Structure formats: C-alpha cells, structure tokens
C-alpha cells in the first residue's frame, strides 16, 4: 500500500544513477546541491550522473562522534539546479517500521520497487573490514550487489541500501540531523 506511492514520488524527482570506478549506484538528492551515495561508491571529483559528467564541489564521508563509519557519502554538485528539499521526510530517530519499500534506480535495475516489509535496527556491521554503525536490516531474498537504493516507508526516507547476502539486505540510516 502507501509506501510505494511515497517511494515513487521521492524517486521521481530526487533519485539518479551514478557510475564510479566501484560500480553503479542509486544516488539520492536531499536539498540544494547536496546528494547522498553509499560510501563504497568512492566518488571522485567528477561523477557520472544519468551517464553525463558532473563536477563534485565538496565531499563528506560521514562518521559518528567516535569517528566510527556510517557508510554514507554526502556530495555537493556543481549544478544551478536545486534538488527538491526532502530533509523534512528523513528519519528523525524512528527507524523500525513494519512496511518498507526498497527503491533501486540504476541503468541495470531501473525503477525497481521491492516491498521488503519489516525493518530492524542492526547497529554494527563489518562492511568489507570497516566497523559501521546505525545499520538497518530487511528481508531481501535475492542478489543485487552494490546498486545503492532508497529504503522508505510512508512519509519517511529511512536509509541507503549498502547491499545484501542473498537473504537480507542492509541500509545505512539516513538521519535528519546529518544535513543540519
């Protein structure tokens, strides 16, 4: 039900596909010139966004207070076009929901909309040797690789998909306080 329509509305205006040396990723524009990618995308000063080149003015790999990884890279795009401001839709705290949608939007998985259901706070994972905090889990009984993605419920952007293991998938929590 309503998570889907919400997801689509967000992806329609604020999602893009980004290609770096480490693959192809859903990116999520948040406000102004600021977007979020998974940290493992490792964007350089020029990204490919919808297969065109875009200059990156500033990058921020997020860590918590302890400098523990959060697996999110904020990037500031050299564009005059502003993203629709979806800061008001980001999770403030509450990140365990019964009905979530994962939305992947890449050149390989265009407009993929999965009802993943219940979202559980995991906390720590070891992502490729890096301790990472504020991880979310959900059932995702399939492939997909590191394609990014946007985890959403009705009225709330929850997370950025960092991958899965054939049964579960995982998101980095995308908190309101990250953007101011």
Automatic annotation (TrEMBL):
Residues 1-179 form the Peptidase C3 domain. It is found in: Host cytoplasmic vesicle membrane; Host nucleus; Virion. Belongs to the picornaviruses polyprotein family. Capsid protein VP0: Component of immature procapsids, which is cleaved into capsid proteins VP4 and VP2 after maturation. Allows the capsid to remain inactive before the maturation step. Protein 3CD: Involved in the viral replication complex and viral polypeptide maturation. It exhibits protease activity with a specificity and catalytic efficiency that is different from protease 3C. Protein 3CD lacks polymerase activity. Protein 3CD binds to the 5'UTR of the viral genome. Interacts with protein 3AB and with RNA-directed RNA polymerase. This is Genome polyprotein. The chain holds residues 1540 to 1719 of 2184 of the full protein.
